[PDB]
Assembly symmetry: C3
Amino acid sequence: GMTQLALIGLWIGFIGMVIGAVIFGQKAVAMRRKEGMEFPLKSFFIVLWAGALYLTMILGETVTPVQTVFWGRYVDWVVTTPVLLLDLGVLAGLRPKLIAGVIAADIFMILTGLVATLEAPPTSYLWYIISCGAFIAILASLLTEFTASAARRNVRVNNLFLKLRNYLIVLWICYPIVWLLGAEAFKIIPTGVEVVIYAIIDIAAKVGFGLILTSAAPEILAQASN
Amino acid sequence: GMTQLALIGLWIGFIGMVIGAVIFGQKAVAMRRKEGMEFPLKSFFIVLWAGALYLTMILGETVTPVQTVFWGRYVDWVVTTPVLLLDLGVLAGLRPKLIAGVIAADIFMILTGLVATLEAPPTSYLWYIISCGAFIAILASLLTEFTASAARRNVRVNNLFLKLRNYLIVLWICYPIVWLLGAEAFKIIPTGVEVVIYAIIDIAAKVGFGLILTSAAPEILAQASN
Amino acid sequence: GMTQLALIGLWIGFIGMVIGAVIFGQKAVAMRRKEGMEFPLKSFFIVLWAGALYLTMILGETVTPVQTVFWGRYVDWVVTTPVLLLDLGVLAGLRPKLIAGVIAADIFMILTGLVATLEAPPTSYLWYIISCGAFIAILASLLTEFTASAARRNVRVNNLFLKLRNYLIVLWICYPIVWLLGAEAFKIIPTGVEVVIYAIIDIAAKVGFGLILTSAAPEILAQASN
Ligand SMILES: *C/C=C(C)/C=C/C=C(C)/C=C/C1=C(C)CCCC1(C)C
Ligand SMILES: *C/C=C(C)/C=C/C=C(C)/C=C/C1=C(C)CCCC1(C)C
Ligand SMILES: *C/C=C(C)/C=C/C=C(C)/C=C/C1=C(C)CCCC1(C)C
Ligand SMILES: CCCCCCCCCCCCCCCC
Ligand SMILES: CCCCCCCCCCCCCCCC
Ligand SMILES: CCCCCCCCCCCCCCCC
Ligand SMILES: CCCCCCCCCCCCCCCC
Ligand SMILES: CCCCCCCCCCCCCCCC
Ligand SMILES: CCCCCCCCCCCCCCCC
Ligand SMILES: CCCCCCCCCCCCCCCC
Ligand SMILES: CCCCCCCCCCCCCCCC
Ligand SMILES: CCCCCCCCCCCCCCCC
Ligand SMILES: CCCCCCCCCCCCCC
Ligand SMILES: CCCCCCCCCCCCCC
Ligand SMILES: CCCCCCCCCCCCCC
Ligand SMILES: CCCCCCCCCCCC
Ligand SMILES: CCCCCCCCCCCC
Ligand SMILES: CCCCCCCCCCCC
Ligand SMILES: CCCCCCCCCCCC
Ligand SMILES: CCCCCCCCCCCC
Ligand SMILES: CCCCCCCCCCCC
Ligand SMILES: CCCCCCCCCC
Ligand SMILES: CCCCCCCCCC
Ligand SMILES: CCCCCCCCCC
Ligand SMILES: CCCCCCCCCC
Ligand SMILES: CCCCCCCC
Ligand SMILES: CCCCCCCC
Ligand SMILES: CCCCCCCC
Ligand SMILES: CCCCCCCC
Ligand SMILES: CCCCCCCC
Ligand SMILES: CCCCCCCC
Ligand SMILES: CCCCCCCC
Ligand SMILES: CCCCCCCC
Ligand SMILES: CCCCCCCC
Ligand SMILES: CCCCCCCC
Ligand SMILES: CCCCCCCC
Ligand SMILES: CCCCCCCC
Ligand SMILES: CCCCCCCC
Ligand SMILES: CCCCCCCC
Ligand SMILES: CCCCCCCC
Ligand SMILES: CCCCCCCC
Ligand SMILES: CCCCCCCC
Ligand SMILES: CCCCCCCC
Ligand SMILES: CCCCCCCC
Ligand SMILES: CCCCCC
Ligand SMILES: CCCCCC
Ligand SMILES: CCCCCC
Ligand SMILES: CCCCCC
Ligand SMILES: CCCCCC
Ligand SMILES: CCCCCC
Ligand SMILES: CCCCCC
Ligand SMILES: CCCCCC
Ligand SMILES: CCCCCC
Ligand SMILES: CCCCCC
Ligand SMILES: CCCCCC
Ligand SMILES: CCCCCC
Ligand SMILES: CCCCCC
Ligand SMILES: CCCCCC
Ligand SMILES: CCCCCC
Ligand SMILES: CCCCCC
Ligand SMILES: CCCCCC
Ligand SMILES: CCCCCC
Ligand SMILES: CCCCCC
Ligand SMILES: CCCCCC
Ligand SMILES: [Mg+2]
Ligand SMILES: [Mg+2]
Ligand SMILES: [Mg+2]
């Protein structure tokens, strides 16, 4: 029931995650019995879950015609975006309870975005604004407590945190902008194009992010983990 | 599909949680880099989640005609009641493995209560009794191992624990009593009145509890958090 | 909607879990002030959750006629199989981050198995293969990382781990074999017989496992817990 372009977009996301899974799985094998192996392993789980959920959408299991609702992508994001933040929190050396609070905010952001996607205007816009409020709090925490914590660590660990922090922030800001421009609000981006855009940003946000992270020198990953 | 009285009750709950969010949000900001900030932060998250779920019920998103089933309140409780017990566990100095067991019992209590609410008599009463059994186990834990652990701490931390322990017990006992008197069992309390009562108890159990906790002297919260 | 044999199988599983919960619950209460009490408590929670889900299937709550899908057993397994792996990880002395990774693989195994159960052939077989891939990763970790960590512990703790590791592995391999032979796939085993078989293996994998673990000498459980 979806457009041909939407199906192409789902295939792009799926193949991207599968390639990521091979890359990070191999890196994790290469890092067995080494400090810092948690980083390729987390990257591997992120792309494995995203890849599985892309497959459920290809198969029509987590999409629903009402326009097609691609609700599987929220099942993906509600699991993978916390693990991405966990990555930065470990790099930053952030206290576990603070990491937990940001993960709670993130899950709230994704679930209110799901409600926004399922609703009709203008109620959908209310939930979009609520979810953006949670996003802004997450961005503020990244730019403040994460950054202050990372600045107390070794220079190379701090440098890697800042690179990934900035990469994550730029990519994540793309999502609510695409949402607002797409069929859920202003209807500027056609539904099929929207699926393709999300797949490209997903690949950047998960495979690109993991490539930057896991390509750091092994000594840096070792000291970052402890 | 709900009565006007029920809608009034949902708005009371919603506005109460929003006011609580302002209070605990300001307290969390004020304790930004102080030991004990975890307490206003958890209180903020509790009323944020409860307020969002009250909003989903106002909007008819988590309410289903089957006779109006307010199943959104279980999505609220299954998340917020564990965090309330975590609060008491940190104050008591309780070992995390013991906190985990009581949280598991609490999630079991809420989920069996959801099955009781969705079921028809007499099967609904079976699940009510099972959920009550989990509740009695939680109460016994609060009165025994939580209380013995708190009694090892200094006088002011122990006194704060006991105040919040007693407050929590009295308010939580109200819930299964309202449930038994309302539409799901004896049908003594009309559905609309039941919604109003839950909103008032919810405000007391989340905002009132958080106010007692977050108004303690900051040095006590700092000591309790260690 | 379900056969008489299938209902008999559900009652066998339910009664087995109730028996386990009495045994492990009383053992947990008897160990209330001792090191190692986490083992009977986790065993109690495992059979409590499984028994409750068996009850939901007896009552038709987590069973849907499609020709009958027993989807409640996935709600059971997604919670209990992680706790069983946690048991082995505590006995082995495994690093918590490693336990978290195998638990993630296990949840993925159970959820992809649920998708396989809900799907139609040949798509169901794709998810079965994916789930088997996760299962193989779990078995590999049990036979490598868990085993290496246990061998660095006291001979009595290590001997207990190996006995439970071998017991668990043999029993868990039975599940995907039954699945492929049964009603969710190739229909060699009648549906009613398949329910009875799952009840028997479930009792062995939860009550039998818990009996072996909690019957160890209390000093062995004590040093394993630390
Ligand atoms: C791997 C997937 C990633 C990094 C997805 C990130 C998604 C977001 C940051 C979503 C943001 C949203 C809002 C801030 C408002 C409501 C709409 C959303 C869910 C797209
Ligand atoms: C903020 C919300 C709170 C503190 C809610 C607490 C709810 C309960 C203690 C519910 C208890 C129930 C039983 C013990 C039996 C079954 C019915 C319930 C779920 C109302
Ligand atoms: C107490 C319940 C237990 C120990 C259940 C264990 C279940 C499994 C190991 C399931 C395995 C499966 C596969 C590996 C492939 C797909 C079918 C499953 C879910 C039966
Ligand atoms: C309807 C079938 C459409 C098939 C579309 C093929 C996708 C083309 C591959 C693009 C994968 C990008 C991988 C990026 C790796 C970093
Ligand atoms: C370094 C260890 C970090 C551990 C992070 C714990 C995750 C906390 C997430 C719990 C939040 C539950 C949100 C439920 C829906 C709002
Ligand atoms: C058929 C429409 C094609 C749509 C092209 C979408 C490109 C969107 C890119 C947005 C951000 C790119 C992140 C890449 C960073 C390396
Ligand atoms: C001091 C921090 C304590 C944190 C304990 C978190 C325990 C998490 C609860 C585990 C129980 C899961 C049961 C799920 C049943 C659906
Ligand atoms: C071990 C748990 C004790 C639970 C206390 C039982 C309270 C009585 C509830 C019985 C349900 C009666 C349904 C009312 C029929 C209108
Ligand atoms: C010691 C810390 C954990 C204490 C909580 C134990 C969990 C007890 C749950 C019991 C549920 C029984 C329901 C059946 C009653 C008829
Ligand atoms: C040291 C104990 C002080 C805290 C005591 C709190 C008592 C809570 C009063 C709540 C009033 C609700 C009454 C409902 C009775 C059915
Ligand atoms: C512990 C529960 C306290 C609840 C107090 C509520 C008092 C008002 C309830 C009156 C309901 C009677 C409605 C009359 C119309 C049928
Ligand atoms: C003693 C160590 C306990 C470790 C428990 C951590 C559990 C983390 C589970 C990771 C969640 C992955 C879920 C994927 C699908 C929702
Ligand atoms: C889709 C699942 C991906 C599986 C991970 C692939 C890992 C490849 C291992 C490569 C090891 C090479 C050693 C030199
Ligand atoms: C649609 C009916 C809603 C009326 C309730 C509004 C109450 C007045 C607003 C109070 C503002 C709350 C400040 C935190
Ligand atoms: C109505 C179904 C008959 C009841 C049979 C009872 C099942 C016995 C379970 C065995 C428990 C095993 C504990 C080791
Ligand atoms: C800042 C944006 C808040 C959400 C407003 C959405 C308005 C969409 C207009 C749709 C016209 C087709
Ligand atoms: C028709 C309005 C009914 C008003 C109900 C008042 C509820 C007070 C509950 C107090 C419980 C602590
Ligand atoms: C409309 C209802 C407003 C309730 C706001 C509650 C703030 C104080 C809570 C005290 C709990 C006893
Ligand atoms: C521990 C709970 C007691 C068990 C009650 C089982 C009730 C079975 C009812 C079957 C009727 C369809
Ligand atoms: C122990 C951590 C390894 C988890 C690996 C999961 C493997 C999933 C395989 C998917 C089937 C192709
Ligand atoms: C690497 C994944 C291994 C999967 C094992 C295959 C299970 C049997 C497939 C038969 C399905 C019809
Ligand atoms: C929280 C403030 C409530 C203001 C009510 C707005 C009414 C809009 C409904 C059309
Ligand atoms: C009222 C709930 C059941 C109470 C059992 C525990 C009482 C022990 C008091 C120390
Ligand atoms: C941390 C103890 C393990 C409990 C696993 C529960 C998994 C629920 C998945 C839905
Ligand atoms: C009527 C079902 C009886 C099933 C027999 C259970 C015992 C078999 C253990 C191998
Ligand atoms: C770290 C995994 C988070 C999963 C959150 C799921 C909430 C629906
Ligand atoms: C029906 C919900 C109206 C809320 C306004 C939405 C835009 C802020
Ligand atoms: C974590 C803060 C969430 C704020 C949501 C409301 C913003 C309008
Ligand atoms: C985009 C959120 C603004 C937060 C900035 C915090 C101060 C660097
Ligand atoms: C059509 C190919 C898409 C490649 C995505 C690249 C992500 C940075
Ligand atoms: C439409 C009913 C609104 C009720 C407002 C309640 C005041 C807190
Ligand atoms: C229709 C407005 C009635 C609101 C009642 C307010 C009770 C707090
Ligand atoms: C500083 C402690 C933050 C704890 C917040 C967790 C809320 C679930
Ligand atoms: C800081 C005020 C938060 C407002 C609560 C919003 C409830 C969804
Ligand atoms: C800010 C909350 C708006 C709620 C609108 C309710 C419309 C039925
Ligand atoms: C009658 C609708 C039941 C929906 C409840 C689902 C809550 C997880
Ligand atoms: C610690 C709060 C999260 C509990 C959520 C459980 C939902 C089944
Ligand atoms: C002590 C941790 C127990 C958690 C198990 C929860 C299963 C219902
Ligand atoms: C069909 C289930 C009936 C159980 C009723 C038990 C009430 C105590
Ligand atoms: C489309 C029929 C299969 C349904 C599978 C649902 C998986 C979430
Ligand atoms: C259209 C889905 C086909 C899945 C292939 C089955 C692999 C055994
Ligand atoms: C993959 C099967 C290995 C089983 C070996 C365990 C010894 C009983
Ligand atoms: C190699 C020893 C494994 C024996 C366990 C089998 C239990 C059915
Ligand atoms: C080593 C066990 C893998 C599961 C394959 C199931 C056999 C049909
Ligand atoms: C792993 C990609 C499979 C593609 C099938 C056409
Ligand atoms: C491995 C995925 C193949 C599915 C084809 C739709
Ligand atoms: C459109 C139905 C999707 C529900 C997502 C949980
Ligand atoms: C059912 C999910 C509701 C989340 C709103 C915070
Ligand atoms: C769970 C939220 C559903 C909203 C449908 C409009
Ligand atoms: C904090 C509210 C954000 C709204 C911007 C769209
Ligand atoms: C709108 C909420 C923003 C919070 C910033 C700390
Ligand atoms: C089909 C769109 C391809 C865009 C390349 C980044
Ligand atoms: C979602 C079903 C939960 C059952 C609790 C016993
Ligand atoms: C858990 C679902 C219960 C529904 C019974 C009508
Ligand atoms: C209309 C009910 C109001 C209740 C406030 C105590
Ligand atoms: C009607 C407001 C209720 C406040 C909680 C005591
Ligand atoms: C019930 C609210 C109490 C507030 C104490 C500061
Ligand atoms: C007919 C009842 C059989 C029970 C087997 C344990
Ligand atoms: C280090 C692996 C943890 C995986 C988190 C989902
Ligand atoms: C792991 C793929 C399916 C997850 C949603 C049930
Ligand atoms: C299932 C095969 C496991 C391999 C053991 C190293
Ligand atoms: C390896 C487990 C031995 C079997 C115990 C009955
Ligand atoms: C793998 C079993 C196939 C059965 C064909 C009837
Ligand atoms: C009824 C059979 C019990 C199986 C115990 C291993
Ligand atoms: Mg929409
Ligand atoms: Mg009901
Ligand atoms: Mg099937």
